[PDB]
Amino acid sequence: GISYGRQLGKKKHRRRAHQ
RNA sequence: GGGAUCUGUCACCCCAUUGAUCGCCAGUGGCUGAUCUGGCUGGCUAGGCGGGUCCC
Incomplete structure (x- = not known):
């Protein structure tokens, strides 16, 4: 709510990522 | 506009804290907030965006 964390x-x- | 390739960024799941460091309260305990993290012939014919190149 109030917290933006x-x-x-x-x-x-x-680990993996789009490439 | 479409396809392929490369690079950068973001998310989730299983297994490595009888591995470590920092901060607050506290000599009972509690908090991941950060980083590190091996297995991708573990899951991108699972996803989104930007740039370059090639082809039509």
């Missing part, structure tokens, strides 16, 4: 897990789940 986002939740993120300790373990990163992002």
Whole structure:
């Protein structure tokens, strides 16, 4: 709501990327 | 306008904190907020956007 932050897990789940 | 390739950015799931560091409160405990992270013949005939090149 008021907060503009986002939740993120300790373990990163992002590796691959569009290319 | 369409197709292919390359590069950059963003999201999700499973497995590596009896790996580490920083900050606040606290000698009971709690918080991922950040970074690091191997397996992509693990999932892009799963997704979006920008630029370059080629072809029609």
